[PDB]
Amino acid sequence: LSAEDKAAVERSKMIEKQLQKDKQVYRATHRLLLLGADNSGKSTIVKQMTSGIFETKFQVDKVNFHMFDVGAQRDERRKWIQCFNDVTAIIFVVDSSDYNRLQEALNDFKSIWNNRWLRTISVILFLNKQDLLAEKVLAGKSKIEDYFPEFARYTTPEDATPEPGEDPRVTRAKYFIRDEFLRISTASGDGRHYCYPHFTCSVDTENARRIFNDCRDIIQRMHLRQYELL
Amino acid sequence: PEEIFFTISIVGVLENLIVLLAVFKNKNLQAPMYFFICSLAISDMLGSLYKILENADDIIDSLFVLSLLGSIFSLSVIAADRYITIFHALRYHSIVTMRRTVVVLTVIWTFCTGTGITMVIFSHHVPTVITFTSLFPLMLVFILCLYVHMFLLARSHTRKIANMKGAITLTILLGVFIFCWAPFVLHVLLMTFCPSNPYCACYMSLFQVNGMLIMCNAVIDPFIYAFRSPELRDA
Amino acid sequence: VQLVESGGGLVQPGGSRKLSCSASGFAFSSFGMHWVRQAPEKGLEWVAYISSGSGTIYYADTVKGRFTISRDDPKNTLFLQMTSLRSEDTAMYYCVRSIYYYGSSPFDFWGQGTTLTVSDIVMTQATSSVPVTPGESVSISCRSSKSLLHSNGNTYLYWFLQRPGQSPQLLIYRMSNLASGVPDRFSGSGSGTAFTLTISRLEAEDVGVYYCMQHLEYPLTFGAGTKLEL
């Protein structure tokens, strides 16, 4: 080991020390991935909480959170969604008032839920524009049962806890819109990942606290599964 | 017979040999939980070599405690690590790193060796009974209050998704520890509370029987606290 | 890239002074730093060393105890304490920059030095003076005691040129590789114990004294120089 090779080893050790600091910062960070549609108002939630990838930074209770909104990319995702394995969660914002597009929303969601590299990744649904949904059925010109025939046999589930000031029909429809996604989620997953439904409007601001709670829940559940107390 | 117990000893030490072979050869499992697992395995070595020592009279019992203290402090360390991971999940990967893991895993052996070497200081004294019969109480209450409290949350999570597979892995990890180590500390208590009872004399006549357990638990500790990780299942 | 040194010019026998070397124009925190002195009319003599990260420190046998080297990366300044000065310490002290990784160029930058007045492989450079005329090729030979080759394949021999009033430059490092801005004329070839430097076409800017140096093991030592008098 000559003198210059010894100095090279010294430089490599310093690089390793800097890499260890970077590794501390890296594990101290939880990453997310904001999926949605053009009308989903995902940017509206970004306002609250050729560039091909955008990046949102936010901190809740002194815990790092990276959110990567996908920008100037094409329609297909079968190749660059592989890059988001080993991500804490995926946020899927859904528009609840474009009934003629909810079906396409589900057809994207099922692929996202069944992807091979996303087979251990939980999804945090933020069903958005609930206020815009309110008028749709309140001053109802359009019937949901046309696009979705099975609205007949369905009724409001017992576990529903609506806030005061709601039409029972409004709740029955809203929880149905909530329920097809959960029907998709519960079909497969082997308990390795779960879906977390939420109702969001443009005025709601607790969207950061909800992500905090659901990420803590996801990590608790994976640890409890490897310990097998779950 | 002696031969069957000795063969059990080699069988048990082989399990730790293969576990340590799996560790440090699979370059991905350098998490602190696996290092605590290997610390448990080293204490299994130091407890089983104590039986092998049966094959100086003072040397024949000098290391009986410096190993059985490691094989309980390591279990407590595993329990606390799991509790911190479950109940401080977000602020754990950042705080508890493989720099505090090193110091904890060194100090756990350091205190156990210190207790083992100070055992001979007061051998024919009451602290050799009292300090050693402290271990079972506080390290059964601290291994109940963590595992059962984790169960109370694994059930509150199972509801939202009392679980059948929660009790079947709580009662094992706890009752094995109890129905292996409790008899030895009970005997330690009885050599303070009943040196005269013929029933207690009959109890002590089974010292070899009560040693058979405490040196067989070293082939269930790697079976339970160690080879239950999904990654190490293949390894 | 610019290294400038500061210090003092007069000191009484016995006492102490502090030198300085303020870097300006390069990543100082990644460069190991040396100190090289020069008697008023003699050759160079290595006197200290501090590495990147301030981990490894060496010294010369002549100043092994009474000299102290230091470093301040945030301020970009290199320091040398000189306590209990002697008559053998009247010299011009140079601040020399050096980095070590695969394929580096150590001793690449030499500062302009500071004056100071007070009231082990051995390498020889016989044929100190030789007349030169432009256009003719000139070879300058340098001799070493131990083989300067190392098992890794390096050969650890450096060449410098000190023009009539300037600071030394790196011509060739490891007796074969040209430095950054050196003209392609200069070339070097050796054996392991015997070395030479080939100047194909002597231009008017190639006069001065040529120095050969080894880096196989500390301490680092120089030759007596070779003056190419016009």
Added chain:
Amino acid sequence: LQESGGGLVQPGGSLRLSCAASGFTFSNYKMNWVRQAPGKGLEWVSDISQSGASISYTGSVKGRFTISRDNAKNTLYLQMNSLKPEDTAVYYCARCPAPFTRDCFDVTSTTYAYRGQGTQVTVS
């Protein structure tokens, strides 16, 4: 994928679309039916897996049109019984990108590779 078998039909008529498949390991791919209507984009309609036992529909054609598979002949089918003026669209036979997978991402994308030419179907 030479999609053909449709055309003009009266309301409430019957059609049987055909998806001529040519050399892509027919019995290992999830397949879909996608139709684009005038003034509208693409939309998934039906889905049959490689086993011929897994099916899925939209709701707008759930109780009316049936999908089927022909592994031996390497052909896909779609049965029509009760068309309506909302079904006026060209029809495309789609293929899932990767084999032996349960995820199909880009079947309804603006540009896709493994899709048929298109079959015209109109309601009068």
Added chain:
Amino acid sequence: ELDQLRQEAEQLKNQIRDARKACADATLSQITNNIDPVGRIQMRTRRTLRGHLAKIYAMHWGTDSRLLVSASQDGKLIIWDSYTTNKVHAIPLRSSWVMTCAYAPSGNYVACGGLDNICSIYNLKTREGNVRVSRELAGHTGYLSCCRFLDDNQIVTSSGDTTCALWDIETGQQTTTFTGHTGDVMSLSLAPDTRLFVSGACDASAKLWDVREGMCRQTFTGHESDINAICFFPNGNAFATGSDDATCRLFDLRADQELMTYSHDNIICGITSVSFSKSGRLLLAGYDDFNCNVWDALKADRAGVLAGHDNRVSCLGVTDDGMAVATGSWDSFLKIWNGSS
């Protein structure tokens, strides 16, 4: 007329298929039925290069067969001294999502790119000591997937956008744009003559391009799903592609067919990175099932396994002296494999 154009295209495609069928006088399998097969090849992980914090996406050797650059989702490009497992530079990147990296032939530059639609060029030999960005290349509308230097001033890129590009680094413009594909270009290898190059683009199609003219020359359509890797045989008259359909195939630029089809029925997992040895006798391919395999080019026999990676191999390169083969994988490691005597 659209119908007339479609009929003409169909007729042209049929004529092309007939012409391709005509020249297939004999198969490589028939000719190689007599050539001596190679024995079982074993490589035994001489070095392991730790230090990345997450999955490794790409790596590239230097022309000296000793230095080594590696790109990871961390946001790092570490240049390793493969001989001593040292670290000479640790380049902190700007975007964490990088899917490609390359090493300039002269050793002066490295490149990297990913979801950020930019090919960043790094200068390694600066007067100030550290590494610095020399140029960001801008125009694309899709994720960059492979960049390969030609000279110190010319680089070629491949993007998810149906486009490959040929840049001029000193200026920063697209001197020539390649616009033939329909899907997402995933791989890109430069011929040794440095005049032609190939790419596979998520539509079962491989296309050879001309660097100077800028026109797609051939178009090979033998696969069933997306092409994930491509690699020139050392002759410069062939290339090999592994795809999601778990199959490798060998294409020859002159014959214009597929020569062999590398497929073991037990392999259901796709293919992710393909490199060749020096003689071209060895075809090393990374698969998603945690291991790489050493195929035999001429004989098409699965004659080696490299099973030491705990996760999916994603990159695989062989040196210019054929004396080391390196694999990186999603296990954040980088193992330098070599044979034993």
Added chain:
Amino acid sequence: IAQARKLVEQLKMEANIDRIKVSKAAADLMAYCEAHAKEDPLLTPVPASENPF
């Protein structure tokens, strides 16, 4: 329309190449492999003294 014309032009340009026999194409690769067989360290191992790994 325009896309069809572009596709037709691309097909016409690539349909005029004078391909050669496949057997010669494969014989070229086998000749290359035979020629450069002795300089393939992974194919044939080298003495450990020269190997730096």
